[PDB]
Amino acid sequence: EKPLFSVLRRQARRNADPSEGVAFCAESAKFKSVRRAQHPAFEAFDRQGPDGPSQKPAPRKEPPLPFYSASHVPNVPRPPPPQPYTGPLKVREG
Amino acid sequence: KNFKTDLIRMQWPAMRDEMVRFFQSQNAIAFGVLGAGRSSAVDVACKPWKRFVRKEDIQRAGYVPCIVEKYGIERRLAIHRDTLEALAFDEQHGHLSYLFQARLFRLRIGNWIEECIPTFVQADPVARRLYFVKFERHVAGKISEVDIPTTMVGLLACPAYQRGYHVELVMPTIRCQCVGAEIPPPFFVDVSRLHYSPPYTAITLQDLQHLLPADGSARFHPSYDAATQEVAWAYEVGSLPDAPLPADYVDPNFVDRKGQKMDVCFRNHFPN
Amino acid sequence: WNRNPSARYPKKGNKGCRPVCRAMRKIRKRLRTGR
Amino acid sequence: EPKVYRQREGMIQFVFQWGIGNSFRAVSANRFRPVHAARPKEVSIHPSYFESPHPFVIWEPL
Amino acid sequence: PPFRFKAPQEVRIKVPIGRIPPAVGPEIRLGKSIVAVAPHRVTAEQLEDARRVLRRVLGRSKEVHQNVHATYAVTRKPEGTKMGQGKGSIDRFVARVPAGRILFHIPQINPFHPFPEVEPNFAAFKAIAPRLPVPVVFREQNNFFQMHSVKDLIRKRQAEERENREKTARDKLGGFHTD
RNA sequence: AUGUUUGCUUGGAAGCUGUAGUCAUUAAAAA
RNA sequence: CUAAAGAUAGCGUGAAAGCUCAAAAA
RNA sequence: UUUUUUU
RNA sequence: UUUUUUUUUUUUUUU
């Protein structure tokens, strides 16, 4: 948080190609993925994320509130500006 | 000994067949009553929205204006009040139903058919009226977030309730991701087996997970936790523990005209 | 109750719904809007 | 007979920020009042739209 | 799991007398529910008396919940003050209850599904509606759908039996050919 | 209609001064 | 004649008796 | 110089 | 069911 006047240390980048688990199968003498088969849509959703520019808000986990609550009011009349992104960078194909 | 008994016993097999046949016939429509393999779609006609026409005019005329907007051009339609409200308010002593937003409307305009789902509804708080209803297209293969309602019809068969214990329905609706050509029907909570426990008793979504389509078209929200996401409770009245006020609580008595919080709420000396 | 003085006689046809010195006009509206 | 409406192949969704103009809004006096506010609108547009014929013409996304 | 959430606390701060804003949308609550029709002020004593009457009428086995809490403070001129000498001391607390807001509700679900011939019970709400300074209307929403109704099936069966009977009667006399 | 004035309070409590419970009738020359 | 009849909804008495209603039949 | 009550 | 309203200056309600 505090001010810094110096060149920041080198930060290693993160990959974009996660691993996968496979197991042998004698019924075809081949290695099959351990993940459960699903719809392409589901597969895509889980992997990348929601398809489209926008989506619906998240559902409620906790039980409802026994009394009314004005949850449709923002925290502040004037939200602060967005903060910069900080983290590992994507690795470009060589 | 009497002959009527004998006759009745002899005739019972025949009588059974009639009920069997009646239920079969009833079931035939799909080409039990509470089965998951039941469609819920509706088909209604519409009228075009004329140029230089206001909302008010249409409303006064006896119609509900609507528009259709995603995966296509913006289309304007008008649906009869007596036709729309009937679906909207499907209870004699109820308000806007949950099921209203969980269907597949096959609207017909001119020479075109649109398979849509209402998203946005503008209804009177007290009176039963519809001002404006928006629609969203549904295309096969695209993820569609839909809130499927739950039913607890089989409440009489509850040992807990029989014994005099209190039973509640926590979750009225469950979120799902529809990909298929049709929306799954309302879920049924089978409460026939719910015994009272000293601490508390509850039912989760893991039990109801078996009600989803076999083809895998529908799926619950990943955010949920089937191992801990309760849907129904069973406890004793006046035997609950004390808990503090939630941090995300907003007092409705300090809301501005604009929908903003009062200056007072930002003060140090502002409990809750 | 508010019934004696002349600032509470309703408008009749051809007055504009706001004659001189009226209070009930703004009282009823306010009442309905919230008391 | 009746037919099911189907969108054109290759179409995608796109959110237009700031706003969308028209004949009316073409006029300066008929412009938007808080000109720096955000007025997003979701519209379907072909990806090929974002292709200029001449190099001297470019498309600023922001 | 279930919890007994603590009620809010009154705010000991002088506030304006501004108007009551309207409601955003209709509030849906399972089971029986009582709501207002017009905006007005309600006092903590009024709400407490309504709660006591509801509890006495219903009994100790049923459960009830409150949806409105008294937090808005209001001042009053003490007896013995001049025209204008500043704001008066806090007098009482009221709750800004706009039209359509819910006051009380019983999540209890009618178990009697195959008995649509009987209207719901609103004796508890009747016992307190005269007390309230606002007009109230009873409400009871459930998960019951048209599709899942036995009335339709009964109707269908009656029709079928009628038809069958008619057919039989016509065929018996032999005034027309068969098949 | 009947077991049945079913039970505990109560000097006494029948369906009908309080409260708990709140189902039992059609069946053995049916195999 | 067949069918049906709440542990008991409204009267009544001193502890009782008695009547009526619901259900059933028509 | 009254209107309405589907099939 | 409608024409008839504070038409509450008087008569009149003649539909």
Side-chain angles (χ1 to χ4, degrees), chain D residues 25 28-36:
Chain D
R25 299 296 187 172
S28 197
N30 300 337
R31 82 199 178 290
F32 292 113
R33 308 304 185 178
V35 170
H36 62 267

Side-chain angles (χ1 to χ4, degrees), chain A residues 53, chain D residues 12-17 20 41-45 50 59 61:
Chain D
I12 58 169
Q13 310 299 100
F14 190 92
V15 172
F16 291 90
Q17 301 290 342
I20 295 160
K41 183 58 163 175
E42 193 178 303
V43 185
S44 302
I45 202 163
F50 319 101
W59 189 69

Side-chain angles (χ1 to χ4, degrees), chain B residues 91 93 126 150 235 253 272, chain E residues 9 63 71 139-140 142-143:
Chain B
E91 294 187 36
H93 305 286
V126 190
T150 54
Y235 64 87
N253 300 105
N272 312 134
Chain E
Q9 294 159 103
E63 179 166 290
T71 51
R139 279 195 179 171
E140 183 173 276
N142 318 280
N143 298 350

Side-chain angles (χ1 to χ4, degrees), chain E residues 21-85:
Chain E
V24 190
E27 193 175 351
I28 293 159
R29 287 289 198 179
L30 304 175
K32 296 169 186 161
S33 181
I34 194 77
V35 313
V37 174
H40 211 76
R41 287 175 153 179
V42 62
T43 62
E45 297 185 30
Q46 292 168 335
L47 284 159
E48 198 71 25
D49 193 64
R51 189 186 68 78
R52 291 190 300 217
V53 185
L54 288 168
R55 290 285 291 170
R56 182 165 176 162
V57 180
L58 291 167
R60 299 185 179 179
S61 58
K62 308 300 185 183
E63 179 166 290
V64 294
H65 293 283
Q66 186 172 348
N67 200 58
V68 282
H69 324 322
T71 51
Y72 207 86
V74 54
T75 68
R76 191 189 206 87
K77 281 284 186 172
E79 191 178 296
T81 316
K82 73 184 199 184
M83 195 68 176
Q85 205 135 244

Side-chain angles (χ1 to χ4, degrees), chain E residues 81-154:
Chain E
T81 316
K82 73 184 199 184
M83 195 68 176
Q85 205 135 244
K87 195 154 190 163
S89 60
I90 300 151
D91 177 34
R92 81 207 95 84
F93 300 100
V94 282
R96 311 202 296 175
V97 192
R101 182 65 62 248
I102 307 176
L103 298 162
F104 298 131
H105 63 280
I106 318 155
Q108 187 65 58
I109 304 154
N110 189 1
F112 299 10
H113 178 238
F115 300 90
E117 314 199 338
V118 68
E119 291 198 358
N121 163 57
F122 298 123
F125 305 145
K126 192 184 177 187
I128 50 160
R131 314 277 88 220
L132 306 171
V134 292
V136 302
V137 63
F138 308 146
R139 279 195 179 171
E140 183 173 276
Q141 180 160 11
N142 318 280
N143 298 350
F144 311 145
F145 314 121
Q146 300 167 2
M147 61 189 172
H148 301 152
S149 180
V150 188
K151 199 176 180 180
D152 309 75
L153 294 160
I154 291 161

Side-chain angles (χ1 to χ4, degrees), chain B residues 125-253:
Chain B
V126 190
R128 302 185 208 195
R129 217 171 202 73
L130 308 170
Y131 302 110
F132 185 86
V133 192
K134 215 188 292 189
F135 285 91
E136 187 175 306
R137 295 186 213 278
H138 165 271
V139 195
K142 305 297 187 178
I143 291 157
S144 299
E145 310 214 327
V146 291
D147 220 345
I148 319 301
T150 54
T151 67
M152 196 186 271
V153 70
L155 189 54
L156 285 158
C158 189
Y161 190 69
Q162 295 166 9
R163 286 284 184 172
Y165 299 111
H166 187 206
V167 184
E168 302 191 48
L169 186 62
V170 179
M171 293 180 76
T173 81
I174 295 155
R175 204 178 200 78
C176 298
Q177 294 178 337
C178 198
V179 177
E182 63 183 35
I183 322 305
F187 296 114
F188 169 59
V189 193
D190 200 11
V191 75
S192 313
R193 303 180 290 84
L194 189 63
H195 299 282
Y196 177 79
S197 207
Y200 89 106
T201 326
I203 296 164
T204 63
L205 294 170
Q206 189 156 278
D207 302 341
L208 309 180
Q209 191 163 19
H210 86 273
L211 301 169
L212 283 166
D215 300 18
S217 59
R219 205 242 302 177
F220 303 135
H221 217 253
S223 60
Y224 290 122
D225 194 347
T228 63
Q229 187 68 33
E230 295 169 337
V231 72
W233 302 336
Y235 64 87
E236 184 78 336
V237 54
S239 64
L240 295 172
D242 297 343
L245 197 73
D248 61 356
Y249 177 80
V250 180
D251 195 354
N253 300 105

Side-chain angles (χ1 to χ4, degrees), chain B:
Chain B
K1 59 181 183 174
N2 61 326
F3 82 109
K4 290 191 179 185
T5 305
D6 192 41
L7 301 173
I8 289 177
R9 287 173 181 205
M10 292 181 116
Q11 290 169 16
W12 166 243
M15 196 191 195
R16 194 174 62 192
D17 298 356
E18 288 266 279
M19 312 193 196
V20 179
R21 280 191 279 81
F22 177 80
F23 282 114
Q24 291 173 351
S25 74
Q26 292 299 315
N27 294 358
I29 196 167
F31 295 119
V33 185
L34 309 165
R38 197 165 178 197
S39 79
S40 72
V42 305
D43 193 357
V44 285
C46 314
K47 287 191 172 182
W49 197 329
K50 281 214 289 155
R51 204 178 181 198
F52 304 106
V53 177
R54 312 174 296 166
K55 290 179 287 179
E56 285 67 31
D57 310 314
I58 298 156
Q59 292 167 355
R60 298 157 187 164
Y63 295 75
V64 186
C66 303
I67 66 102
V68 196
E69 51 152 23
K70 198 172 184 172
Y71 302 125
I73 56 163
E74 187 183 308
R75 270 208 176 79
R76 299 199 184 168
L77 307 169
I79 308 160
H80 201 237
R81 261 211 297 274
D82 296 349
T83 318
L84 203 71
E85 299 184 346
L87 305 167
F89 316 94
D90 70 329
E91 294 187 36
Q92 198 178 247
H93 305 286
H95 215 241
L96 188 68
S97 186
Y98 288 103
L99 188 55
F100 182 72
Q101 302 180 86
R103 330 197 71 164
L104 198 80
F105 293 74
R106 277 156 174 161
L107 307 183
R108 186 174 173 168
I109 184 56
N111 304 328
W112 302 98
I113 298 155
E114 293 173 314
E115 298 181 321
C116 49
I117 323 178
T119 69
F120 182 85
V121 197
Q122 196 195 349
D124 190 81
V126 190
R128 302 185 208 195
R129 217 171 202 73
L130 308 170
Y131 302 110
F132 185 86
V133 192
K134 215 188 292 189
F135 285 91
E136 187 175 306
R137 295 186 213 278
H138 165 271
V139 195
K142 305 297 187 178
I143 291 157
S144 299
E145 310 214 327
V146 291
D147 220 345
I148 319 301
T150 54
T151 67
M152 196 186 271
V153 70
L155 189 54
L156 285 158
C158 189
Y161 190 69
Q162 295 166 9
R163 286 284 184 172
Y165 299 111
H166 187 206
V167 184
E168 302 191 48
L169 186 62
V170 179
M171 293 180 76
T173 81
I174 295 155
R175 204 178 200 78
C176 298
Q177 294 178 337
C178 198
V179 177
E182 63 183 35
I183 322 305
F187 296 114
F188 169 59
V189 193
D190 200 11
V191 75
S192 313
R193 303 180 290 84
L194 189 63
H195 299 282
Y196 177 79
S197 207
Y200 89 106
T201 326
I203 296 164
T204 63
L205 294 170
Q206 189 156 278
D207 302 341
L208 309 180
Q209 191 163 19
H210 86 273
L211 301 169
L212 283 166
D215 300 18
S217 59
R219 205 242 302 177
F220 303 135
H221 217 253
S223 60
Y224 290 122
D225 194 347
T228 63
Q229 187 68 33
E230 295 169 337
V231 72
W233 302 336
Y235 64 87
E236 184 78 336
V237 54
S239 64
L240 295 172
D242 297 343
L245 197 73
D248 61 356
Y249 177 80
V250 180
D251 195 354
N253 300 105
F254 294 93
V255 192
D256 300 340
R257 187 177 179 153
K258 302 184 176 186
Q260 307 294 338
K261 293 186 290 189
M262 291 176 190
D263 189 71
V264 182
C265 303
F266 304 107
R267 295 178 188 164
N268 306 69
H269 65 179
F270 182 78
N272 312 134

